[PDB]
């Protein structure tokens, strides 16, 4: 019955379910980022040569560069029967608050972890800004998640790759003392009571200091029917506004402003609740956050289910056996070269007794002299001289080195190309666009376009706080994937150039060229050309 | 996609002009593509 007991039951179930895949993913990350010689603190370990001769890392670098050369971003497009520019405002807002370094870095981190381990992820969060807000004195930013395989535990009963059917999800935060102080400061928690949770790491490297403080954030999605209030817009038409979004703030300010309630329907939607939990108590209970979706976007490589168990893989898991075999064989051969006697003659001491200074290595003599006689045996026994055999690498070692390297080269071929990995990234970006659209509808000031101009209908409460008023006719655009851009002007330039490259030299060619000069950026010479192009378009009507 | 496919097989004649104007008409909306689409719409309406 306890909230903590229910939360911990769910977390324990998911943590136990996702155990094998997480362990393999952590091993792949360690293998491809720290050292291919695993098993630190093996009790039975002496000092022996352990060299790291790498063949998987150039492949991983090649794949990561290939994925980086072809960026993918969200592209909102108008729905069927919607107004032809139903997506311009949302696209502008997305480009505005997703142009920073943080969004790009989060996507890059997730992609690199997808290539190596098999799963990455990132997060979307909403912050308050007063200097450069996207809208409504707020911003939506994207944040990275490092080692998502162990730091994001998804609801077990989710059979979808993007995890859009997951009812809850827990994200584990590990912090040092100062990190915990800042965390408690930012969430208004008690910094004196040190928190604790499941440790998602492993003392697998001799890192001299490891982290000690753990918290968890538990997100849950509740889908229910809630009351909506149908009004009549003082300008024209009838809007629909959620009762919970203006439950106390402006319920009478609407009436004062001139909104008359027409009816009241029950509409089913989802709400997202966050809780800050340690292993002993719940610190924040059900803090409601903006949006309908869990704000975590996962990216996968090779993904599937085997027997009610989710498995994912990157590009490194299959090559590990061959790489480890090659490292071991090269270490054995290095030991052969180091600790093996060299090729030298075998002498009896009496054979060279007295001429011991001829074989030390100097070149002062034209030959070598040997003793011939012994007093008690008449003459020294005659036997051909022997030399210690030269060190040699065994045929087994040579064959195994060649075959292990060949196996690694044969199995470390993602795809034929990264088409499937780019498609999984595109799926993740589409889910990201869905989440961003929901959060925008929740917190941002979305203008409605009239065909009679954008009409932003909002009002302020008695506490000077402004409550946004978004109608229910909000999902006017769907999500596609297109080239990554920084601004709507850049996107328009790309579209005009694409049209230009395909239009033959006629009158639309002139139109498109003048349009490009119109949309071009500003200096002095380009300013002159843009003024001329505007004049020409206007004078051509 | 259908208009592009037709354009790819019709030679450069009056049907080619009609299909180019139609493809401009069926474009998404920004500002410049809005101008181009309005131009294509007016030309198609005027051409009867």
């Amino acid at each position: 019955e306890n909230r903590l007991e229910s939360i911990l039951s769910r977390f324990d179930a998911d943590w136990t379910a996702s155990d094998e895949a997480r362990r393999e993913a952590k091993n792949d990350l360690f293998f491809s980022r720290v050292s291919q010689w695993d098993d630190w603190l093996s009790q039975y370990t002496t000092l022996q040569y352990r060299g790291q001769f790498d063949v998987v890392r150039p492949v991983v670098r090649k794949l990561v560069s290939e994925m980086r050369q072809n960026p993918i971003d969200v592209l909102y497009r108008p729905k069927d029967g919607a107004r032809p520019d139903a997506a311009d405002v949302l696209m502008g807002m997305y480009r505005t608050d997703m142009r920073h370094n943080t969004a790009k870095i989060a996507v890059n981190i997730a992609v690199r972890e997808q290539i190596e381990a098999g799963v990455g992820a990132w997060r979307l969060v909403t912050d308050y800004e007063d200097q450069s807000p996207t809208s409504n004195n707020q911003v939506i930013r994207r944040e990275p998640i490092h080692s998502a395989c162990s730091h994001v535990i998804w609801d077990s009963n989710s059979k979808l790759m993007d995890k859009s059917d997951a009812r809850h999800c827990t994200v584990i935060h590990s912090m040092s003392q100062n990190g915990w102080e800042d965390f408690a400061e930012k969430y208004d928690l008690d910094a004196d009571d040190i928190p604790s949770f499941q440790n998602p790491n492993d003392w697998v490297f001799p890192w001299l200091t490891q982290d000690t403080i753990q918290i968890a954030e538990f997100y849950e999605v509740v889908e229910k029917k809630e009351t909506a209030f149908i009004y009549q817009d003082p300008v024209t038409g009838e809007p629909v506004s959620y009762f919970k979004r203006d439950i106390k703030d402006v319920i009478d300010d609407l009436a004062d402003s001139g909104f008359i309630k027409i009816a009241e329907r029950q509409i089913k939607r989802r709400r997202v609740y966050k809780s800050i939990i340690t292993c002993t108590a719940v610190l924040k209970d059900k803090q409601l956050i903006a949006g309908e979706h869990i704000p975590i976007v996962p990216v996968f490589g090779e993904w599937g289910f085997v027997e009610d168990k989710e498995v994912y893989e990157g590009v490194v898991r299959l090559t590990k056996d061959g790489q480890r075999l090659r490292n071991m064989i090269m270490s054995f051969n290095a030991d052969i070269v180091a600790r093996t006697p060299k090729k030298k003659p075998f002498f009896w001491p009496e054979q060279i007794a007295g001429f011991e200074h001829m074989y030390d290595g100097n070149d002062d003599y034209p030959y070598y002299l040997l003793n011939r006689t012994d007093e008690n045996s008449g003459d020294l026994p005659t036997q051909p001289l022997a030399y210690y055999e030269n060190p040699e690498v065994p045929q087994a070692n040579a064959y195994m080195l060649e075959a292990a390297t060949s196996a690694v080269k044969e199995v470390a071929t993602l795809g034929v190309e990264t088409y499937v990995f780019q498609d999984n990234l595109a799926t993740a970006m589409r889910r990201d666009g869905e989440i961003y659209q929901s959060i925008v509808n929740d917190i941002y000031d979305v203008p409605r376009n009239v065909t009679i101009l954008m009409a932003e209908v909002v009002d302020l409460a008695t506490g000077e706080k402004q409550v946004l008023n978004d109608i229910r006719g909000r999902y006017e655009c769907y999500t596609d994937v297109g080239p990554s851009f920084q601004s709507m002007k850049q996107q328009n330039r790309a579209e005009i150039l694409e049209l230009l490259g395909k239009t033959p030299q006629g009158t639309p060619e002139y139109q498109l060229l003048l349009l490009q000069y119109f949309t071009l950026l500003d200096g002095k010479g380009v300013e002159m050309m843009r003024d001329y192009a505007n004049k020409q378009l206007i004078q051509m009507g | 996609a259908e208009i592009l496919e037709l354009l790819g097989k019709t030679p450069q004649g009056t049907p080619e002009y009609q299909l180019l104007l139609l493809q401009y008409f069926t474009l998404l909306d920004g500002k410049g593509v809005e101008m181009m689409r309005d131009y294509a719409n007016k030309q198609l309406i005027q051409m009867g």
Binding site: I194, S196, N199, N201, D202, W203, T209, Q210, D211, T212, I213, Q214 | -
Partner: protein, 53 residues
């Protein structure tokens, strides 16, 4: 075996669990492996009051 972070003191240990099917029982072991060394005992000190005969 999994990691198990001892708070308060900045240390980590091992949390290891095992199961027995012939009894349907289980064992848990929380182990901390550390050692205290006094590297500069000429710097360490001790103060003793009331040290009269």
């Amino acid at each position: 075996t999994t990691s198990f972070s001892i708070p308060d003191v900045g240390l980590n240990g091992i949390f290891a669990t095992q199961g027995d099917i012939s009894t349907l029982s289980g064992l848990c072991r929380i182990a901390l492996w550390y050692g205290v060394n006094a590297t500069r005992p000429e710097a360490i000190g001790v103060g003793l009051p009331g040290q009269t005969a």
